[PDB]
Amino acid sequence: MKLLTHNLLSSHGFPLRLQATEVRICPVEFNPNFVARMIPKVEWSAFLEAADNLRLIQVPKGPVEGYEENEEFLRTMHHLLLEVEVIEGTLQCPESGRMFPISRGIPNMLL
């Protein structure tokens, strides 16, 4: 499960709480045009807490001024949103406290 997927699953308010026991790095080809069009769509609180839980460092606090032209910000965001895959972990429903397992990178949202 990628952090962009976590973000789509949590969007709309309280986001799904991510926890992981196995996280791996998966190279994805850097597409700056896609990353830049995802930046205004990112729900940043959900993203920051998810990245914090996966023990990720130097996570941008929000979009930079003129991020469309800033490659380093787009590479950082590409990495954090697409290349950090949770393989084993859980997604927790905030209101009920229910845990949804993530196994082999696939979250199970089925009750």
Partner: protein, 210 residues
């Protein structure tokens, strides 16, 4: 770097299908000729795959998701109720070496407004089965429209075209019959039609008002 219909169809023929399919879940894959034509049209005619976040509802073993990823989607997310189906899809995603794919196990009929207008495009070959007087393809279609920001591409029976169009007018969304497809279910299937092709389906493009 562009893919022609025949090349895409040949690559989709490498996608492994259902090992032990579940009859009640309508686990039949989109045939490479149907899937390639469908995906090629989405990208070349409407430009709804390349650098888009696509959702595949009832993704099964991944035929439509694997082809969408190969056509340049930023991310393709497949959704399916069956774990066994997603395990084959996960295997195909690893083997095709596709890095722009994700997967979720869930019931599309019981989906939360947590994914409202979260995708650019939604693609699907849905189940047609009746579930409390409503056909599953229509329950999937209302979910798809809630999720997609730009377009929904879906397969619905041609015989029931009147009901789909009636619901589009009611939902106040744009509708477009792209093609009329005629495919048979896998030869393995026990109850095939003898006077016609098994499935007479319409490839439909649903869009929104500006």
């Amino acid at each position: 770097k562009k893919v022609r219909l025949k090349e895409l169809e040949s690559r989709l023929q490498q996608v492994d299908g259902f090992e032990k399919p579940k009859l009640l879940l309508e686990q039949y894959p989109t045939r490479p000729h149907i899937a390639a034509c469908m995906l090629y049209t989405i990208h070349n005619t409407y430009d709804d795959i390349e650098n888009k976040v696509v959702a595949d509802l009832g993704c099964g073993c991944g035929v439509l998701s694997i082809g969408t990823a190969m056509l340049g989607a930023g991310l393709c997310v497949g959704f399916d109720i069956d774990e066994d189906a997603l395990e084959i899809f996960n295997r195909n995603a690893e083997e095709f070496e596709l890095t722009n794919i994700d997967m979720v196990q869930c019931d599309v009929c019981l989906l939360s407004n947590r994914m409202s207008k979260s995708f650019d495009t939604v693609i699907m070959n849905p189940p047609f089965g009746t579930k409390n007087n409503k056909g599953t393809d229509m329950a999937f279609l209302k979910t798809a429209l809630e999720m997609a920001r730009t377009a929904v591409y879906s397969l619905h029976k041609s015989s029931t075209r009147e009901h789909v169009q009636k619901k589009a007018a009611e939902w106040k969304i744009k509708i477009d019959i792209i093609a009329e497809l005629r495919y048979d279910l896998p030869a393995s299937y026990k109850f095939h039609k003898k006077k016609s092709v098994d499935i007479e389906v319409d490839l439909i493009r649903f869009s929104f008002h500006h």
